[PDB]
Design an enzyme around this catalytic site. Structure first.
Site, PDB file in Angstrom:
ATOM      1  N   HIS A  18       0.835  -1.182   0.000  1.00  5.01           N
ATOM      2  CA  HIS A  18       0.000   0.000   0.000  1.00  5.01           C
ATOM      3  C   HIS A  18       0.869   1.231   0.000  1.00  5.01           C
ATOM      4  O   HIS A  18       2.060   1.163   0.316  1.00  5.01           O
ATOM      5  CB  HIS A  18      -1.016   0.046   1.169  1.00  5.01           C
ATOM      6  CG  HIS A  18      -0.408   0.080   2.551  1.00  5.01           C
ATOM      7  ND1 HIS A  18      -0.098  -1.061   3.242  1.00  5.01           N
ATOM      8  CD2 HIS A  18      -0.130   1.108   3.395  1.00  5.01           C
ATOM      9  CE1 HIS A  18       0.365  -0.759   4.434  1.00  5.01           C
ATOM     10  NE2 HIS A  18       0.378   0.551   4.549  1.00  5.01           N
ATOM     11  N   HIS A  40       8.574  11.648  -6.504  1.00  5.41           N
ATOM     12  CA  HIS A  40       7.304  11.626  -7.201  1.00  5.41           C
ATOM     13  C   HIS A  40       6.893  10.214  -7.564  1.00  5.41           C
ATOM     14  O   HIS A  40       7.731   9.311  -7.594  1.00  5.41           O
ATOM     15  CB  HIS A  40       7.302  12.530  -8.444  1.00  5.41           C
ATOM     16  CG  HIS A  40       8.166  12.047  -9.579  1.00  5.41           C
ATOM     17  ND1 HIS A  40       9.493  12.391  -9.732  1.00  5.41           N
ATOM     18  CD2 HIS A  40       7.860  11.275 -10.639  1.00  5.41           C
ATOM     19  CE1 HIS A  40       9.962  11.865 -10.848  1.00  5.41           C
ATOM     20  NE2 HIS A  40       8.990  11.185 -11.414  1.00  5.41           N
ATOM     21  N   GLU A  86       2.870  12.066 -11.540  1.00  8.68           N
ATOM     22  CA  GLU A  86       3.154  12.138 -12.961  1.00  8.68           C
ATOM     23  C   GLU A  86       2.232  11.196 -13.711  1.00  8.68           C
ATOM     24  O   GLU A  86       1.967  10.087 -13.253  1.00  8.68           O
ATOM     25  CB  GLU A  86       4.606  11.774 -13.183  1.00  8.68           C
ATOM     26  CG  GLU A  86       5.076  11.674 -14.623  1.00  8.68           C
ATOM     27  CD  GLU A  86       6.473  11.103 -14.748  1.00  8.68           C
ATOM     28  OE1 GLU A  86       7.128  10.898 -13.698  1.00  8.68           O
ATOM     29  OE2 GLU A  86       6.933  10.816 -15.886  1.00  8.68           O
TER      30      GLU A  86
HETATM   31 ZN   LIG Z   1       8.989  10.378 -13.324  1.00  5.45          ZN
HETATM   32 ZN   LIG Z   2       1.225   1.529   6.136  1.00  7.62          ZN
END
Ligand SMILES: [Zn+2]
Ligand SMILES: [Zn+2]
Ligand SMILES: [Cl-]
Ligand SMILES: [Cl-]
Ligand SMILES: [Zn+2]
Ligand SMILES: [Zn+2]
Lengths: 140, 140
Positions: free
Chosen positions: B8, B67, B116
């Site tokens: 997760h 990112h 992105e």
């Molecule tokens: Zn990237």
């Molecule tokens: Zn966690």
């Protein structure tokens, strides 16, 4: 559904050598490419990129619970804890857990990115919450 | 190989309502659970959690290129750009790209987490780099 899954994750790192070692030894990722200021890894089919940003402030990240968890077995978790200790990894004190939360270890990379090794599944968590939790809405 | 894939991802958010809307409308994630200070989503099989942390400083995150990228088609990318503009999303100016980099849009959630939309693959990037790049080591 216009998205087709995770494409890659990128971490900004202060020291490429030190971070490569962490990603190899701790997350068990396979190094694919190393440039001056960049590295690419494959971790079980996931593209991980490291990008060097040397002199940026990295204090506030410590206060945020943003984190990424990877699946491990219960046996793997006990072994991994000793690997983390042997490598002087920054291990975080976890939250309180119910047994039904399943087990976790939380830790960081050298630049404060929080990671978790987790032994449960989403379906474990949903079944727990549906049985036990009030003050919650379930949409599935 | 002791890890078994991403389990997760969790994002710390300042405003649960505002963040739920972003994750639904922008990332197209399906809301599964909403509590006082927590939400869970499924995005194409990925468990996403939002955890509320109201009053923490969220400035330094802006300076880090960390990112997460999601796969989209070229057609999806043009549509998604207008969706981002229509929803007043913080769109980031991308880096310079070679054609062989394939196309991307970069943007943030309300709390500065960088995302992105990317139209390429790791194999596109490796083939590009192997053909073109010096000052780089290839391990595959
Ligand atoms: Zn990237
Ligand atoms: Zn966690
Ligand atoms: Cl209660
Ligand atoms: Cl050159
Ligand atoms: Zn109650
Ligand atoms: Zn040169």
């Amino acid at each position: 559904a216009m998205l087709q899954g995770i494409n890659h994750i990128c971490f900004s790192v202060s020291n490429l050598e030190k971070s490569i070692e962490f990603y190899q030894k701790i997350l068990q990722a396979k190094l694919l490419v190393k440039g001056r200021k960049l590295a690419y890894f494959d971790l079980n089919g996931l593209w991980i990129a490291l990008n060097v940003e040397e002199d940026i402030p990295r204090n506030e990240i410590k206060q945020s619970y943003t984190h990424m968890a990877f699946t491990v077995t219960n046996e793997a978790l006990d072994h991994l804890k000793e690997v983390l200790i042997q490598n002087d990894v920054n291990i975080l004190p976890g939250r309180e857990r119910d047994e039904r939360d399943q087990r976790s270890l939380y830790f960081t990379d050298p630049d404060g990115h929080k990671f978790e090794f987790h032994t449960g599944t989403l379906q474990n968590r949903l079944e727990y919450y549906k049985e036990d939790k009030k003050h919650m809405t379930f949409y599935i």
